[PDB]
Amino acid sequence: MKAFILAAGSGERLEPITHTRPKAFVPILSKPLIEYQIEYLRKCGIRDITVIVSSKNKEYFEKKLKEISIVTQKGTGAAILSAKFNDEALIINGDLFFSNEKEICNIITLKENAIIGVKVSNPKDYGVLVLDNQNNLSKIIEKPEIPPSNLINAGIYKLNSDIFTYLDKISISERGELELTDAINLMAKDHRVKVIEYEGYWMDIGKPWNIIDVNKWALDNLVFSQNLGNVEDNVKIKGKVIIEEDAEIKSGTYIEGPVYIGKGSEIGPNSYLRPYTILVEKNKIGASVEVKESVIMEGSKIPHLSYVGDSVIAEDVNFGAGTLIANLRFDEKEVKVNVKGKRISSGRRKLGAFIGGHVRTGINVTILPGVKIGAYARIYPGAVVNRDVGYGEFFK
Amino acid sequence: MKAFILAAGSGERLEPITHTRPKAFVPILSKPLIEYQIEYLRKCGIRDITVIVSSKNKEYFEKKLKEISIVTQKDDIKGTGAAILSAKFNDEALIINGDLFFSNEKEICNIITLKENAIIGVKVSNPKDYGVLVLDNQNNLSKIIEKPEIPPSNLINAGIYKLNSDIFTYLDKISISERGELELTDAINLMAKDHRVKVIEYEGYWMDIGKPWNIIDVNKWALDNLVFSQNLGNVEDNVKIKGKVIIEEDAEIKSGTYIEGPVYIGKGSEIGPNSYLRPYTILVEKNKIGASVEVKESVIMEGSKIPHLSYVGDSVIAEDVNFGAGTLIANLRFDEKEVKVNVKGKRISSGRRKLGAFIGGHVRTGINVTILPGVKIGAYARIYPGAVVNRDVGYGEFFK
Amino acid sequence: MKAFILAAGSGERLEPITHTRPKAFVPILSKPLIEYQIEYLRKCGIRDITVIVSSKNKEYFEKKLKEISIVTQKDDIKGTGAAILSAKFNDEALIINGDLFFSNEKEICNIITLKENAIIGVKVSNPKDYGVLVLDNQNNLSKIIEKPEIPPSNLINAGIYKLNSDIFTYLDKISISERGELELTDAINLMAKDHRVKVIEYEGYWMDIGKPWNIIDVNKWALDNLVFSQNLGNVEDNVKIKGKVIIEEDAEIKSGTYIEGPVYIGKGSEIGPNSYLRPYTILVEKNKIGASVEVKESVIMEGSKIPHLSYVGDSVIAEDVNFGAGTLIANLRFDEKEVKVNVKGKRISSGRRKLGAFIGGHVRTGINVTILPGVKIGAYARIYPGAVVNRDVGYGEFFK
């Protein structure tokens, strides 16, 4: 079976993380999203895997990925136009994290066309599956204002080469787009499209807080207590902690699991790591530094007198002493974030900041809830960051 | 003996604490001021205790007090004279001011056995601020001089009386009052002309809770004198405890916490890791004190949380307060002189070289807030991240 | 042999440290610079030592120094030539610049046995900033070129001379006038034409204390080379000590403190709980370092206190300083280039990528103060709570 990972979006909704990396390389603990997808495909015996990517990202993917074909897109309909297969293929959206491979292993043994459905609490935001009374696909309704069902399109398809025929027929939509689901809808009129319901953990990494979501799940479900580092005396560890090689934890550090401490990290003295602290790799967490429910990416340093809660901090970031993130509004309502120029609810009462790569903060910087700081920004000592900060912006 | 507690003042001097509670319910360790008063009255065998309160506070007192009569000051005159106008007794009663904390009950037990009228006197260092007792040469009361500019004596009116129903006769003589005030002491002065008013001098600890810093005063004394080392909580390893520490039930103290007594840790509190509790830290109940948080000589009331990277010194923080990370209180002027506080619109000295802030109930501070010495923050205020609070903040004010 | 220490400069380049002390009394660990110089002279058998000082500093020197002659630079002419005009000797004398720290005494012990005039040369990496020695082909002194734009050599004038009374004759021949002062080296240049001036090259550690960062330089060297692990204080349990730590008498170190040597903890200091002392922390005497306070590569002078929630890196803090809670020093520029400092009104490079602040005596910072890299704060300054100190602050200035 050939497999195609569709990873050709701009990743705009995931800014500022995607200022410096494609969505497919967002870390989940110590490894990129796309390595999970590949690994799970391979458990099903699939060997021939291709990723479809944008022109601008091709080189990044080639650097990172060894024995995987990388093809540039020449929407999801547009992406599969660059998929070269004769009979049938497995197609997965590249923004998905999924815990289970067996549904995929099943669907690649079917002769018929098939898709995966999953139940979500917000079907409004997705393609909703309407089933006929043999429980095969009737149609996919993109983002219905009144959703007839909880069952959505999971973004996992086993499609026959007949899909190209249906792709050629499509013009549409009212939202000014081609799609992939439009072609499936035409296919379902003439063919029986099976729907396999998916019961495991499923998340699309659409918005920056979803990085926290999947990292928490991974930490809860995919790893187990380990210590390959050096823990000094007077370190207190409760619950599940993963300590990778070369990580150093100094006296007075206090850890309430679950916590992930990546390779080469340097912690303490007198640090406090709270549940769902994910330190991806080579992180510096220093004295009187407290971290909670945050993803802190490769090489980033929080050396002195700082609190990082409910945040995503990208790679190579440095926080001057006394940089603080606010994670709660005064009125305790859900924290709003600007995502592609729309102000939307994160769904979280507690939410900190999203900080791009190579950011530097001066000493005594104050960051407000839900704020995005673009890659390469500088925040000047003492500043109150009360809005989004642009790529490379020097905030004074 | 009937007893009356006079608790019908506005409590304005005690703002912002009294924005959300009557003075009688100011905590002293884990219990309100009035419960001490009631408990000490009961040690003398008194059972019939009434509290006289304002109309607006009646419901609050009823909620809080079980087997105590609550009577409203049947308006509409202010002062202690007006308050005892609602006290219903036939012959004699024990009367105490509801702003007082007193360590000793035995002077009270004595005075309720006397047939004569009697009052308690106590020696203070600042008699200028009080009613001074002038004694005749049989050491009975001559007169009470309210706030004399040149005080003839250290002996003041302690606000504890055993008075006969004749006081009502003298109260009726006293001229009300464009200002709508009636002072009980004016009636006692008329009574002392015609009767022998005995004066029992009180040698124990006595304090009135007049200004917000007096909340620290009495809490300190209580911690020093009324409670003893106890641990009903859960103390992790690598907790360092020196001197006297009271840990109530369900309190959790995490590793790295360092405690220099005397310290009171109220029920359900959550401390540490890596907290520092200095002498005269009083955590009333269900308090959160987190990592890199230091507290010294402060009263932190019910449910209040100081979760990260903060220093709280010489302060009173009321109920349900939340300090954003990095909120700091200044407690010392650069010139090291006494810290001044605005009390009923007058700028006065606290009498303290070290004094922090007084924070009302339900306040929220943003991250990185800076609060200056002697500042009052009204209940329900919100302080915006990074603000420098260099003046008093109003009730419900959003300070930016 | 008579010896003269020339300590009569204004010390302006070392402001703000020299706002309250002469350069001679800058501490190196627990003792002033000049006590090292005296001690090393005495290892050579020298007993008759005189210090030449300014009129304004005479009394300070007399208070501090016991059995040492103190002479004021009479002449109101500035420079080293002017200074030795007040040196009274008949035949020969050892002359040392009072800004020098030197590890070795044996070069001095040799040079005082020579009949000829002699000077000490040392190799430095920045000869541009000093008098460069040009040697003749017998390796004697040809001439000293003050601050040559193109330096012909690494060998500079170390500021250590054994000169004969003939130097006064050459001093009388030389100009002034008065930018533009009387330089001792100009007289040595005339002397070298008529006499053989020997040059002994110095291979040990040599530093002049010219700019405020040099206080860090020499303290680091002293800590690395002159002292060894010791504990005369009281260390509580759960203190972690790595590498070399000197703890002087009466110092107290509280639980949770973490120390990465080398570190000097001076007498009577009070550390912790939960403090972090990083390499090259020098706490000269009676210092307070409190909870959640981190120090690295800094010299903190007598009686100075950093009690809460502060980071002090790559800094010099003078005597009797108090940092309000949450005072932070920045020690790195965003562009990672060398930190610049204003020194006598010229903006120059410190030569350091990491450099914090230089803080004068008796400074007080309010809570939550932010100090930028390379900033100087004059003695007696006050910094208002929440201020961002982004320029130099004057002597006694109230920065708001």
Side-chain angles (χ1 to χ4, degrees), chain A residues 1-168 170-174 176-396, chain B, chain C:
Chain A
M1 233 320 148
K2 278 170 171 288
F4 296 88
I5 302 170
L6 311 187
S10 57
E12 183 171 355
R13 286 186 303 146
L14 218 66
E15 286 177 4
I17 283 73
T18 46
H19 287 162
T20 56
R21 78 177 72 215
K23 183 183 296 195
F25 297 92
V26 165
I28 298 166
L29 306 190
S30 69
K31 85 189 179 222
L33 171 65
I34 192 159
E35 279 179 28
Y36 293 92
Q37 295 163 350
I38 289 161
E39 183 203 337
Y40 295 169
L41 292 184
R42 286 179 175 157
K43 290 174 167 172
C44 291
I46 295 160
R47 295 349 278 182
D48 185 342
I49 299 163
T50 300
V51 195
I52 299 166
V53 309
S54 69
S55 280
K56 79 213 301 279
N57 290 331
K58 174 145 73 76
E59 196 186 313
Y60 197 106
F61 280 86
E62 282 165 342
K63 277 217 306 292
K64 299 297 195 219
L65 294 176
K66 189 104 84 196
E67 296 186 322
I68 300 298
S69 313
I70 295 146
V71 173
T72 72
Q73 183 169 312
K74 317 109 194 293
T76 48
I80 64 149
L81 290 181
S82 308
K84 288 169 224 186
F85 63 102
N86 302 316
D87 293 319
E88 23 178 41
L90 185 74
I91 297 164
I92 67 156
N93 290 348
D95 63 12
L96 303 174
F97 180 85
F98 46 90
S99 64
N100 294 181
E101 84 286 9
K102 289 253 214 303
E103 297 85 353
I104 287 167
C105 300
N106 184 80
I107 233 173
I108 67 178
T109 70
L110 308 177
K111 55 199 149 64
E112 308 100 314
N113 296 290
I115 74 165
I116 303 194
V118 64
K119 288 184 171 150
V120 297
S121 60
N122 59 325
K124 273 279 302 276
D125 303 329
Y126 293 105
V128 170
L129 312 183
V130 176
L131 307 177
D132 69 21
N133 46 52
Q134 289 64 239
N135 300 308
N136 303 305
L137 185 61
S138 162
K139 100 206 81 154
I140 302 178
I141 303 170
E142 284 294 332
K143 345 244 300 201
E145 282 144 43
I146 179 274
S149 184
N150 265 325
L151 223 222
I152 69 163
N153 182 14
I156 298 165
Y157 321 96
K158 199 285 302 191
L159 302 179
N160 304 330
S161 63
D162 298 304
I163 195 74
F164 294 112
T165 303
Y166 293 104
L167 263 7
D168 264 289
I170 63 141
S171 253
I172 351 219
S173 69
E174 160 68 332
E177 182 72 345
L178 84 165
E179 300 169 16
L180 167 55
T181 51
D182 284 327
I184 289 165
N185 287 167
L186 296 184
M187 188 176 71
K189 298 295 186 194
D190 305 337
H191 296 82
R192 187 174 58 97
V193 179
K194 298 197 60 258
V195 178
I196 302 320
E197 169 164 356
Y198 182 98
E199 300 289 343
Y201 178 74
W202 177 89
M203 171 63 75
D204 66 306
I205 304 173
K207 288 140 305 196
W209 57 86
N210 298 326
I211 298 168
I212 294 169
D213 298 332
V214 299
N215 271 273
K216 293 172 68 171
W217 186 90
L219 190 48
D220 281 336
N221 295 106
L222 299 179
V223 285
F224 312 100
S225 294
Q226 73 153 230
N227 178 24
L228 290 165
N230 177 46
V231 183
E232 291 182 345
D233 37 48
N234 276 199
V235 172
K236 169 55 139 306
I237 293 169
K238 302 171 170 188
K240 182 209 270 180
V241 189
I242 287 54
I243 305 164
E244 300 282 30
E245 57 191 32
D246 302 320
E248 187 189 13
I249 311 186
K250 301 178 172 175
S251 304
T253 296
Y254 195 95
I255 306 174
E256 285 164 329
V259 166
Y260 182 86
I261 304 171
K263 59 182 69 274
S265 288
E266 185 178 304
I267 313 297
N270 303 326
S271 297
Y272 182 21
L273 313 182
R274 280 173 68 200
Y276 305 105
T277 296
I278 293 97
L279 307 178
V280 348
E281 184 178 15
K282 289 173 166 156
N283 294 291
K284 166 72 165 170
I285 300 299
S288 305
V289 175
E290 176 180 343
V291 183
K292 174 235 173 182
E293 187 149 340
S294 297
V295 183
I296 305 181
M297 296 188 194
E298 302 91 330
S300 287
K301 308 187 163 160
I302 317 291
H304 322 274
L305 291 153
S306 293
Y307 175 55
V308 178
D310 299 285
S311 300
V312 183
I313 298 182
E315 73 289 353
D316 299 318
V317 168
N318 194 285
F319 270 19
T323 300
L324 300 175
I325 294 175
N327 62 340
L328 188 62
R329 290 155 56 114
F330 285 128
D331 64 22
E332 310 212 13
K333 305 260 292 311
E334 296 171 355
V335 177
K336 305 263 189 73
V337 180
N338 306 314
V339 177
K340 287 183 82 174
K342 321 222 83 205
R343 192 154 188 76
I344 61 170
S345 174
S346 67
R348 301 172 68 92
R349 179 166 150 284
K350 299 256 189 96
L351 181 64
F354 309 113
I355 313 277
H358 308 278
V359 169
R360 304 190 104 232
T361 71
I363 60 164
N364 243 333
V365 162
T366 293
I367 304 169
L368 268 58
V371 157
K372 291 162 41 176
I373 300 181
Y376 298 93
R378 297 168 175 188
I379 315 302
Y380 277 70
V384 180
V385 187
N386 60 355
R387 46 163 257 247
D388 297 345
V389 175
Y391 188 97
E393 179 172 7
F394 295 8
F395 188 91
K396 288 196 180 72
Chain B
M1 232 319 148
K2 279 168 172 288
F4 296 87
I5 300 170
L6 309 187
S10 57
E12 181 170 0
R13 287 185 304 147
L14 215 67
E15 288 176 6
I17 282 73
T18 46
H19 286 162
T20 56
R21 78 175 71 216
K23 183 183 297 194
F25 295 92
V26 165
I28 298 165
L29 307 190
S30 69
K31 84 189 180 222
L33 170 65
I34 193 159
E35 276 179 30
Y36 291 91
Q37 294 166 345
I38 288 160
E39 183 202 338
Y40 295 167
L41 292 185
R42 286 180 173 155
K43 290 174 167 171
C44 291
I46 297 161
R47 294 350 279 184
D48 186 340
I49 299 162
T50 300
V51 195
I52 299 166
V53 308
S54 71
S55 280
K56 80 212 301 279
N57 292 327
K58 176 143 73 76
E59 195 187 313
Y60 198 105
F61 281 83
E62 284 165 340
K63 276 217 307 292
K64 299 297 195 218
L65 295 176
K66 189 104 84 196
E67 297 185 322
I68 299 299
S69 314
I70 296 146
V71 172
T72 72
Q73 181 168 308
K74 309 276 157 44
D75 274 301
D76 48 83
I77 306 167
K78 65 130 51 138
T80 48
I84 63 149
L85 291 182
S86 309
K88 288 169 225 186
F89 63 102
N90 300 315
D91 293 318
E92 25 178 42
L94 184 74
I95 297 164
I96 67 156
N97 286 349
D99 64 10
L100 302 173
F101 181 84
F102 45 91
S103 64
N104 293 183
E105 84 286 8
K106 291 252 214 302
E107 298 82 3
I108 287 166
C109 299
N110 183 80
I111 232 172
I112 66 178
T113 68
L114 307 178
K115 198 195 149 64
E116 308 101 314
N117 297 288
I119 74 165
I120 302 194
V122 63
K123 287 185 172 149
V124 297
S125 60
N126 59 327
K128 51 234 96 116
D129 303 328
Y130 293 108
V132 172
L133 312 183
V134 176
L135 308 177
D136 67 24
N137 46 52
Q138 289 64 241
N139 300 306
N140 301 305
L141 185 60
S142 163
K143 100 205 82 154
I144 301 178
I145 302 171
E146 285 294 333
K147 345 244 300 201
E149 279 290 321
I150 277 272
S153 183
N154 265 327
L155 222 222
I156 68 162
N157 178 21
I160 299 164
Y161 322 99
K162 200 285 303 191
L163 303 178
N164 304 329
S165 63
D166 299 305
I167 192 75
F168 293 111
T169 302
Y170 294 103
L171 265 171
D172 264 287
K173 284 219 269 287
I174 274 147
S175 167
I176 175 221
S177 195
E178 191 268 315
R179 317 198 261 67
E181 333 165 351
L182 206 69
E183 298 173 11
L184 179 56
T185 51
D186 284 326
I188 289 165
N189 287 166
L190 298 184
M191 188 176 71
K193 298 295 186 194
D194 306 336
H195 296 83
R196 282 172 59 238
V197 180
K198 297 196 60 257
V199 178
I200 301 319
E201 169 167 355
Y202 179 97
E203 299 289 343
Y205 179 73
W206 177 93
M207 173 64 73
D208 65 306
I209 305 173
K211 287 140 306 197
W213 58 92
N214 299 322
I215 300 167
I216 297 169
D217 298 334
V218 297
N219 271 274
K220 295 172 69 172
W221 187 93
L223 190 47
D224 280 338
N225 292 102
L226 298 179
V227 285
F228 311 101
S229 294
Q230 73 151 232
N231 181 22
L232 291 163
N234 177 43
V235 181
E236 291 181 347
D237 36 49
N238 276 198
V239 174
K240 168 57 139 306
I241 292 170
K242 301 172 170 188
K244 182 209 271 181
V245 189
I246 285 55
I247 306 163
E248 301 282 28
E249 59 188 32
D250 303 320
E252 188 187 15
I253 310 185
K254 303 177 172 176
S255 305
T257 295
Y258 196 95
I259 305 175
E260 288 164 331
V263 165
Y264 182 86
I265 306 169
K267 59 182 70 274
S269 287
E270 185 178 303
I271 315 295
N274 302 327
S275 294
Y276 183 19
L277 313 183
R278 279 171 69 201
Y280 302 106
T281 294
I282 292 97
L283 309 178
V284 350
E285 184 177 15
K286 289 173 166 156
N287 295 290
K288 165 71 165 172
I289 301 297
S292 306
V293 177
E294 175 183 341
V295 184
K296 173 235 175 184
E297 190 151 335
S298 297
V299 179
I300 304 182
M301 296 187 195
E302 303 90 330
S304 289
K305 308 185 164 161
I306 319 291
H308 325 273
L309 289 153
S310 292
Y311 175 54
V312 178
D314 299 282
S315 299
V316 181
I317 297 183
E319 74 287 357
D320 299 318
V321 171
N322 195 285
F323 273 18
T327 298
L328 301 173
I329 294 176
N331 63 338
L332 187 62
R333 292 155 55 113
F334 285 130
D335 64 23
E336 310 212 14
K337 306 260 291 312
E338 295 171 356
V339 178
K340 304 264 190 72
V341 180
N342 307 312
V343 178
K344 286 184 83 173
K346 321 221 83 205
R347 192 154 188 72
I348 61 169
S349 173
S350 68
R352 304 172 67 88
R353 179 166 150 285
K354 296 258 189 96
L355 180 63
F358 309 116
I359 315 275
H362 310 278
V363 168
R364 305 192 103 266
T365 70
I367 58 166
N368 245 329
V369 162
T370 292
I371 305 169
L372 266 58
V375 159
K376 290 163 39 177
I377 300 181
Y380 300 92
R382 293 133 64 109
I383 311 303
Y384 187 81
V388 181
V389 188
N390 62 351
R391 45 163 257 248
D392 296 340
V393 175
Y395 185 95
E397 178 177 353
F398 197 164
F399 188 89
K400 285 199 181 72
Chain C
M1 233 319 147
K2 280 169 172 289
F4 296 89
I5 302 171
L6 310 187
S10 57
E12 181 170 357
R13 286 187 302 148
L14 216 67
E15 288 178 2
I17 283 73
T18 47
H19 288 162
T20 54
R21 79 176 71 212
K23 182 184 296 195
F25 297 93
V26 163
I28 298 166
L29 308 189
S30 69
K31 83 188 180 223
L33 170 65
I34 193 158
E35 277 179 29
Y36 292 91
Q37 294 167 346
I38 287 160
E39 184 201 338
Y40 296 167
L41 292 184
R42 286 179 174 156
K43 291 174 168 170
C44 291
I46 295 160
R47 294 349 279 185
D48 186 341
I49 299 162
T50 301
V51 195
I52 300 166
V53 310
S54 69
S55 279
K56 80 212 301 279
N57 291 329
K58 175 144 74 76
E59 194 187 312
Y60 197 104
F61 280 84
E62 281 165 342
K63 277 217 306 292
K64 299 297 194 218
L65 296 176
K66 190 104 83 196
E67 296 186 322
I68 299 299
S69 314
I70 295 145
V71 174
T72 73
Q73 181 168 309
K74 287 108 189 20
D75 304 305
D76 252 298
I77 306 166
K78 72 138 47 138
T80 48
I84 63 149
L85 290 181
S86 307
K88 288 169 225 186
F89 63 103
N90 299 318
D91 293 319
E92 24 178 41
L94 182 76
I95 299 164
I96 67 156
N97 289 345
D99 64 10
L100 303 173
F101 180 83
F102 46 89
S103 65
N104 290 178
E105 86 286 7
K106 291 253 215 303
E107 298 82 3
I108 286 166
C109 299
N110 184 81
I111 233 173
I112 67 177
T113 70
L114 308 177
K115 200 195 149 64
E116 309 101 314
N117 297 289
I119 74 164
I120 302 194
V122 63
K123 288 184 172 149
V124 297
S125 59
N126 59 328
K128 272 280 302 276
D129 304 327
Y130 293 105
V132 172
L133 311 183
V134 176
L135 308 178
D136 67 22
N137 47 51
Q138 289 64 240
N139 300 308
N140 301 306
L141 186 61
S142 161
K143 101 206 81 154
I144 301 178
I145 302 171
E146 285 294 332
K147 344 244 300 202
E149 283 143 43
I150 179 274
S153 184
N154 264 329
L155 224 222
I156 69 163
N157 179 18
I160 300 164
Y161 322 96
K162 199 285 302 191
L163 302 179
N164 303 331
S165 62
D166 299 305
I167 193 76
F168 294 111
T169 303
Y170 294 104
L171 265 171
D172 263 289
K173 286 219 269 288
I174 62 137
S175 310
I176 313 221
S177 43
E178 174 64 332
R179 183 226 182 90
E181 348 109 16
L182 204 70
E183 298 173 12
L184 178 56
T185 50
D186 283 326
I188 289 166
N189 287 166
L190 297 184
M191 187 176 71
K193 298 295 186 194
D194 306 337
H195 296 85
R196 281 173 58 240
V197 179
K198 298 196 60 258
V199 178
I200 302 319
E201 169 164 357
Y202 180 100
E203 300 290 344
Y205 179 73
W206 177 92
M207 172 64 74
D208 66 303
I209 304 172
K211 288 140 305 196
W213 58 90
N214 299 326
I215 300 168
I216 295 170
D217 297 333
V218 298
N219 271 272
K220 295 173 67 171
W221 187 91
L223 189 48
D224 279 335
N225 295 104
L226 299 179
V227 286
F228 311 103
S229 296
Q230 72 152 232
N231 181 19
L232 291 163
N234 177 44
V235 181
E236 289 182 346
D237 35 47
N238 276 198
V239 172
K240 170 55 139 306
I241 292 169
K242 301 170 170 189
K244 182 209 272 180
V245 188
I246 284 56
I247 305 166
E248 301 281 31
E249 57 190 32
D250 300 320
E252 187 188 14
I253 311 185
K254 301 177 172 177
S255 306
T257 298
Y258 196 94
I259 306 173
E260 288 162 329
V263 165
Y264 182 85
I265 304 172
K267 58 185 207 235
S269 288
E270 184 179 303
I271 312 297
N274 301 326
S275 296
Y276 183 20
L277 311 185
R278 279 171 68 200
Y280 304 104
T281 296
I282 292 98
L283 311 178
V284 345
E285 185 178 14
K286 288 173 167 155
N287 293 290
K288 167 71 166 170
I289 300 297
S292 306
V293 175
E294 177 180 341
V295 183
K296 173 237 175 181
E297 189 150 338
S298 296
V299 182
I300 305 182
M301 297 187 196
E302 301 90 329
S304 289
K305 307 188 163 161
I306 318 290
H308 325 272
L309 288 155
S310 294
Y311 176 52
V312 176
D314 298 286
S315 298
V316 182
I317 299 182
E319 72 288 357
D320 298 318
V321 169
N322 193 285
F323 272 18
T327 301
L328 300 175
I329 293 174
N331 61 342
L332 188 61
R333 290 154 55 114
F334 282 126
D335 65 20
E336 310 212 14
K337 307 259 292 312
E338 292 172 354
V339 178
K340 304 263 190 72
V341 179
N342 307 318
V343 178
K344 287 183 83 174
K346 320 221 83 206
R347 190 154 189 76
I348 62 169
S349 176
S350 69
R352 301 173 68 89
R353 180 166 149 285
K354 298 257 188 97
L355 179 65
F358 310 110
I359 316 276
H362 307 274
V363 166
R364 306 191 103 267
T365 70
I367 57 164
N368 242 335
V369 160
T370 293
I371 303 169
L372 267 57
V375 159
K376 290 162 41 177
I377 303 180
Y380 297 95
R382 292 136 63 126
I383 312 302
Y384 186 81
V388 181
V389 185
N390 60 356
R391 45 163 257 244
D392 296 338
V393 176
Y395 189 96
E397 178 175 356
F398 295 6
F399 190 91
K400 287 197 180 71

